[PDB]
Amino acid sequence: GSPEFMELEIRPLFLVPDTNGFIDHLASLARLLESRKYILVVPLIVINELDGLAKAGGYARVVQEKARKSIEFLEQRFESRDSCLRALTSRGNELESIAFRSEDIGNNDDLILSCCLHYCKDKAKDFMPAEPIRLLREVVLLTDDRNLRVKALTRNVPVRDIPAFLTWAQ
């Protein structure tokens, strides 16, 4: 051996967007959900951010309208019991309903990352080969934000911007 390092077996199933993803790319997120190829897992904190944006003129009005469209989309799909859409709290609980939702209780950025990390609980034995040390990653963080991207890269969470993911997913 040369010195050991971890590698990722990347096989996307759970996709985790940030708030900007809804504001800028709602149509793409909807197309992904309609594909049935993926489970979109929305952090509760992202829903909280969207609700705060939704409630003006100018830029405030622009973002308000986009946040309202995002909430209307999420509420409709959750009420239809869309099997490819989930919500996840900071403490690891999956929601099938977002009616009467609460504020998720250390940045908002840390909470989104923890949501991703809910899908990469590695056990001690996964690090012992019988070869590459390789670990399964079924989650992808969908973001254009440099801060989150670097957080994800350093914490072993696959990461891609929405436009490129949609293209790659065909």
Swiss-Prot record:
Start and end residues of each PINc domain: 13-150
Quaternary structure and partners: May form homooligomers. Associated component of the telomerase holoenzyme complex. Interacts with TERT, independently of the telomerase RNA. Interacts with SMG1, SMG5, SMG7, UPF1, UPF2, UPF3B and the PP2A catalytic subunits. Also interacts with the exon junction complex (EJC) composed at least of CASC3, EIF4A3, MAGOH and RBM8A; required for the process of nonsense-mediated mRNA decay. Interacts with DHX34; the interaction is RNA-independent.
Tissue: Ubiquitous.
Free-text function comment from the UniProt entry: Component of the telomerase ribonucleoprotein (RNP) complex that is essential for the replication of chromosome termini. May have a general role in telomere regulation. Promotes in vitro the ability of TERT to elongate telomeres. Overexpression induces telomere uncapping, chromosomal end-to-end fusions (telomeric DNA persists at the fusion points) and did not perturb TRF2 telomeric localization. Binds to the single-stranded 5'-(GTGTGG)(4)GTGT-3' telomeric DNA, but not to a telomerase RNA template component (TER). Plays a role in nonsense-mediated mRNA decay. Is thought to provide a link to the mRNA degradation machinery as it has endonuclease activity required to initiate NMD, and to serve as an adapter for UPF1 to protein phosphatase 2A (PP2A), thereby triggering UPF1 dephosphorylation. Degrades single-stranded RNA (ssRNA), but not ssDNA or dsRNA.
Domain notes: The PINc domain confers endonuclease activity and is expected to bind the catalytic metal ion.
Shown stretch of the complete protein: 1239 to 1417 of 1419
Effect of D145N: Loss of endonuclease activity and nonsense-mediated RNA decay
Record annotation: effect of changing D18N: Loss of endonuclease activity and nonsense-mediated RNA decay
Binding site for Mn(2+): D18, D109, D145
Protein's cellular compartments: Nucleus, Nucleolus; Chromosome, Telomere; Cytoplasm, Cytosol
Name of this protein: Telomerase-binding protein EST1A
